[model samples]
Each structure stands twice: as C-alpha cells, then as structure tokens.
Target: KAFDLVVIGAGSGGLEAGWNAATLYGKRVAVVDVQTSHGPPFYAALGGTCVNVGCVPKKLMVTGAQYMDHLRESAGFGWEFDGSSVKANWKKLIAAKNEAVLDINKSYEGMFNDTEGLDFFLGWGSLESKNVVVVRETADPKSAVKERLQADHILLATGSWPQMPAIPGIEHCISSNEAFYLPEPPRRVLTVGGGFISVEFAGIFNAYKPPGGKVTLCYRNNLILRGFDETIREEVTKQLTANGIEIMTNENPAKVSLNTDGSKHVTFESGKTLDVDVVMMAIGRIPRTNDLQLGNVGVKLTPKGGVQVDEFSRTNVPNIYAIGDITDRLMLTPVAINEGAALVDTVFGNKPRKTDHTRVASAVFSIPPIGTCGLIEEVAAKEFEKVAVYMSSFTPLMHNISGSKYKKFVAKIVTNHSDGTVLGVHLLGDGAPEIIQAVGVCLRLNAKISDFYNTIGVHPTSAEELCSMRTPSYYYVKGEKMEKLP
Candidate 1:
C-alpha cells in the first residue's frame, strides 16, 4: 500500500513533520518509533529532549540547587532555614521524572492516534528501499529483515542515541539514557563531555547533591563550550569551578575501573585518576540510524553517521529526506522542528522553505544557566570583516543582599564593519534562555547595534545590558587589527 509520507521516529522532528503533512497538507502520514512508550529519553517527558532529559530535568535540578544559596541568604532576608541540613530525595526525584516522561509520551501517542490524516506505528522502523520503510513491533525479531512499502516520500527523523565508547571497563559507566535511572544517589559523580548535556549535568549533580557530595567534569579538550562566546564560557567555567565541580581539561579518560569498594575510578591519559560513585559518559550522542538499513538502499550518511541532505532536507534520493540529529547540521530541537515542518511544506503544499542554521539560539542548563543565540566571540572575529564585542558581567540585584556569589552576564553583538550589519548575537547568564530567544528574533529581523542602543533599556534587568553596551570592550577589524572597545 502507498502513503503520502512515512516518517521514521516519533521524536520532535518526526512528529512535527507528520503533523504538518497530515494537518496542513492533508497528506496521509505514518509515524514510527523504536520505543513502545512515547516518552522522550531522560527528562520530565513532555517536550521531547527539551522538556525531558535535556532541558526540563536539568532546570528542575537547577531549581533544587538554588536552595543552597537561598539557605545562606534566608537570614539576610530576615528568614531562617537550615542551609547545611536541607536534604534531597533521590528516589522521589527519579519517580517524579518517570511520571512526567510517561505522561508526555501518552500525549504524543494520542496526537498521532487522533490526527485525521496520520497513522501511529508502535514499532521499530527500517528502510527497505529508497522510498519504503518497514515497521515491526519491538518484540518481532523479523523486523530486522528488509521489507519494502510504497510511499511517495520517506522522511528520516530519527534523533540520536547515547554513545558508550570502547574503553577498558567502559561497561561500568552509564550514559544519560541510563544515568537518570540509577537506583541510589551517587556520593561522587564523574561526568564526561564538554557539550551542553555534560556541562549542565555536572553543575546539577554537584550543586544539588546531598551534603558532602561532589561532582567532577572531565574534558579532553582545552576548554568546555568550545563554540560558545569566550566570555560566557570563561564565566561559566569560573562559576562551575568555584561551586566545587572539579574540572579536568586537556585530558582523556584512558580507562574506567571498579575499585575495591565497588566505586568507579576513571584513569586519564595525563596520569590523573578520579574515584567516584557514578561515572556518566555524556561524551555525546550518535544518530539513531543503525536499524534503518541505509546501506541497503544507497542513502548517503556522513562519516559521523548523519544523513546527507540538502537545505530542504532532501537526500540523494529525492523521494527521501532527512532531518534532526540524523542530519547532524544542528542538533537543537527547534532546528529539527523547523526542518521537519519546512520539509512538509515544500513537499506537498507548494511552499518551498529552506533551513537557515545560522543565528540559532541554544542554552546550557547549568546551575546559573547560560543561553546564546549566535556566534561566539572567537568565531565572530574570524567570520566578520570587523568584530566588535559588547558585554556585561555582573551580579543580579537579588543576589546582592543575599551575599551570594556574583553571577556573570554577557551580551555580545557581532557586526560587519563594512556595512555595519549585525552578524551575530551571543549572551550567557541567568535568564539567558529567555534573553537569547527575544534577541534571536531581533537578530533574525536584522536589528542593528544602534537599534539596541536606541531601545529603552529595562530598568535593573540582566538583559538591559544589551541596550547599554555602547562602547565595546574589544574590537577587531580586517587584517586582524585589534583595539579595545574604549
């Protein structure tokens, strides 16, 4: 039987594509996923990774960690609480997270079931040919066999999966997929990875742990957050370090072992080692395309295992398209959703939309949180003819009276000196997610540096720094001519 569209994976990208195909274009759509449950991996479970394991769970942990400061400042606010004695319920938190994930999974399943032009497939999906995908129940081993179905278009929206590298005793470590389900609270957790997930989890585990707990973040690179604004990265590093997260840079984990006490110990290439209760391998995720028989059909994938696709998400096979992490262009959820919806529009609605990965906003759910919408300070200097940076690092007013450590904030605007066009927008700090989203619109609208200055600054808000940064702290012109913003 033939269908208008067959979407693989019911993750954010797949669901959006299916929704657009069925609701907007009136096309018959079928959505397939490997997990029988609709819930996303690792989080509260509502909004894919953004709501589940990645964003929501991290933020919830952040909220819980904030009490560390609140306990300290409660006295300053004329209130009293035990800063040292407050406790966290590990079992309760995990249970709440499970309930949240299950609830969200149900919502998506219902949408697929209720959508007028959509069919929900609760099974593993594999590509049988260029334009066909076969779905089989999770229990059916035969689903592994290649089978063909006729479809006008096939959209590969499979997201990503946790990766466990082949290291000695690596089996002792857990990825985020299983880290969230640990039965007991880890006294000392070691997290590896420099990406948003790794950085965020490091902060959460360290700050929200039971009294005397510790967390360490190990990186093989020179710095964490390589693509983020340097100022923001530096500030986050300082904050995380000051908060007691032992950060190991320029060192790779050579081996992991179960110590005599049954604890995990990670030995680094630099001759350093750490023993901890939990070792989380947040190294990164790989595209979830293993089961989809791409090799059998000639669909090309990148060396990193992402599908090769054009701006419109069309693969080498025109009838087949790819989106989300499977494409590896931009791993953010919003980028995937845009690609999915835009692909549907172009395919059936006569509206051709191309994906613009530039100026996409993202955030790190660290204890103090960091969000950014554009190029980093270093990247802007490299890409633009002239790069000017405007930033502010300050403590929020609320924390002033509380004696909490002053958190850093930065709002950097990158402009082309030739035409004075705003090229990039980046910021990091508390409220960064909200600020980046608001400024992302401005950046998308092509707002100029002057427009930022001309707009009335909100009184006392952290975001107001953007409007007030008239004199840049640094500048770089063509030929690498550098000058201070003053």
Candidate 2:
C-alpha cells in the first residue's frame, strides 16, 4: 500500500504533519509510532514526550510545588495555619499526574482514529528504502503480521530521549523520563547537569518534599542556564539558593556506587562524596534516529546525529523530510508544530512556506520562573552599533506587604539605541511567562520604545512596569559602556 505521506513517530511534529496533509490537503497519510516501557517503573505512551513526560507533567509538578509557597505565605495573607505542618502526598500527586497524561493519550488516539484519509500503526517504523518503510509490532517483532508502507514522502519526527553520562553504576541513575514516575519522592536528590531540565527538576524537588528533604544541583560550570541572559542566571541562582536548593559548581561526578542502605554514593572529581536517595542525569538529549536506518538509505545526518534538512525541511532525498527534535532545529514543542505545518503547506498544498525561527519566547519553570524573547543583553550589544537597556528590579506588592524579603521581580527591555526598536524582553518573577508572551508580540512586530511608553499601563499590576519605564538603566555603544546617554 502507498500513501501520500507516511510519518514516522506520532509526536507533536508527526501528528501535525499527518493531520494537515490528510485533512487540509486531502492527502492519504499514515502515522507510525511505537511504545516501549523502561523496566517496571518507567513507561512511554502515545502523544510523545510533551504530553507523556516533558512539558505537561513538568508544569503540573511545578504547580504542585507552588502550592507549598502559597501555604508558606498564607500566614501573611491573614490565613492562620501551621505552615511547618503542611505536607504533600507524593503518591496521590503522581497518580493524578498519570491520569492527566493518560487522558491526553486517549485524545490523541481518538483524533487519529476519527480523522479521514489517515491511518495509524502501532509498531517500530524504519526506513526500508528511500520511499519504503517497514514496521514490526513492538511486542511480536518476529511475527508474520509486519507492515510495509510506501509513500511519496516520509517525515521523520522521532523525538529525542534522555541521555546519561558514562560512569560505573550509572544504570542506577534516573533521567527525566523516570523522574516523572518515581514510586516515591527521594529523601535527598542529587541532580547532575547545568541545563534547564536539571534546574527545573531541582526546583520541583526543592519545593515539594519532606521537611528535611534535600535537593542539590551539581553543575560542572560556574553557572546554571548557560544560554539565558547573565542577569537571569545570577538572579535565578540567588532565588534558588534562598529557597534552599544547594548549588554545587565546578563539580563533576567521577563515579556512582550503591550503599548498603540502598542509597547512591556519588564521588566527585574533588574526591568529595555524597550519599543520596536518587541521582538524576539531565546532562543532555540525543536525536532518536538510531533504529530508523537513516544510514541504510541516502539520508544525511548532522554531526550531532540529527537528520540534515534544508530550509523547507527537505532532506537529501527529495521525497524525504524531517522535522522537530529529530532535525535539532528548536527542541520546543511549538516550534516542531510550526515546522510540521510549514512542511505540509510546501509539499501538499502547493504553497511554499518556511518556519520563522526568530524572537521565539521560552520559559523556565523554576521556583521564581523566567521568561525571555529575542536577544539577550550580550547578543544585543554585539549585533547592533548601539544598545539601550531599560530594567526594573523591585519587591512585588504581595511580597512587600507580606514582608517576604526573598521574593523579587526583575524586568528588562533591550532596544536598539539608534531607532529605539525593541530587541528583547526578559522577566523573572511570578507571571513572568504570561508577561513575556505579550511582550514577545510587540518585539515580533518591531514595536519601538515610544510605543511602549505611550501605551496606558493597567494600574496596580506588575506588568505595568514595562510601560512605565522612562529612562535607560544602562547604554552602550560599539560594546563600550557610555557613562550617560545624551
């Protein structure tokens, strides 16, 4: 049987591609996906990583963690409760999370089942040739009931998996994949990495844990969140530390050993050792293309193992394409969805479109959280002849009234000095993601500083700070600091 489009891996990208081709363009599409559980505790379901583990579950856990903060601050809000006595039920939380995940999986299944001009397969799919794909049942791989699918075009959207470092006893460590379904909360967790995954997980563990539970983030570098703005890196670290998350810098795990009491003993390069109940590796993720047999065909891959593709998502083979994390474009879910839509328009709709990768907004759901769009201060200064920065740092009204010294809000707008066009907007505080989302629109439209100044700000709101800024906190020209702007 032949299809107009045969998509491998029904993740966000593949699902969108199949849906668009089938429903919009009236093309016959078939999507192939597989499920494999990692031992007894770890499970992989439909709807890919975002719904199963990465974004959805992580946000739910962040929300759960925020409840602890509310309870802690409720006393200052005229609520009387023993904040110290507040406790979270780990098992109940995990159960609720799992139920939510399953709901999404059912929805995805229903969508595929009902969509016309589309077929779904449950098995491991690989490239048999340029236009041929072979799928074998995951459970009965050697069975006679295998499928051979031929298509005019094949899209590879198999997302990435968690990667662990090479060390002895590393098998005992868990990745973000298993962290979501842990049987119980660890008493002490040692998360090793410097990426957003490590920091976000550390925040979740720090906020929702037993009274004496400890969360330590060990990074080899001096800072966490390396790609973000420097101010964000410093401020978020301060906030995480104030909230009792221990940050260990310049440290690399040399080895891991099992203790007699079932704990993990991690030895660092400095000859220091720490025993913990859990050790999670959030080091990085690699593209999920090993079993796809890209090498067997003429498909080319990047040095990092991602499928090589052109601007239109077309691979070396004209009839083959790749999108999402498999292409290593932007690992974000929304980016993948856009790429899928663009590919469908270009291939099936007879309309060529390319995904715009500029000024994309992202958030880090830490204790204080972070939201950013466009260039950082460092990049802005280097890219433009002159750069102007407007920033505000203050204790929020709620924190001020509650006398919570640790809670703070930071906002900055980076603009081109010559034309006053906004270059970037960054925020760190409660509702930072929501605020940056609106700011991202303005930056996308090339709004100027005067536009922000002219807009009427809502009263008694944290977001009004963006509109009320009247002076530059700092200005630079040709990468040199200017004492005072004329």
Q: Candidate 1: misplaced stretches above 4 Å?
A: 38-52, 138-148, 479-481, 484-486
For residue 475, model 1's alpha carbon misses the true position, in angstroms, by 0.9
Per-candidate Cα RMSD to the true structure, in Å, reads: 2.6, 2.1
**Candidate 1: residue 468 lDDT (0-100):** 81
State the displacement of the C-alpha of residue 5, model 2, in Å, after optimal TM-score superposition: 0.6
Looking at model 1, the pairs that clash are 42-53, 43-52, 43-53
Question: What's each prediction's clash count?
Answer: 3, 0
Report how far off residue 418 is in candidate 2 (Å). Answer: 1.5
The best candidate in terms of TM-score: 2
Residue 45 lDDT in model 2?
50
lDDT of 1: 0.76
lDDT of 1 by residue, 234-325 (tens): 78888788778888888778999898989987898988888888889888788877778787788888888888888899888879999988
Q: What is the lDDT of residue 34 in candidate 1?
A: 54
User: Taking the tens digit of each residue's C-alpha lDDT, what string does model 2 give over 1-486?
Assistant: 799999988887898889999999889998887753212232545677777878888999989888777877777789886656777887888888888887788888888789987888878888878999888765333544368998899999888888889998899899998889788888799999978899999988887677689999999989988878778888899889888889998998899999999999999998999888999999888888887878778799899988998889999987999999998767888888899999999999999999878888889998788998888878888889889999999889798656566777888888998999998888889988888887878987898888998999998888898998878889878887675676
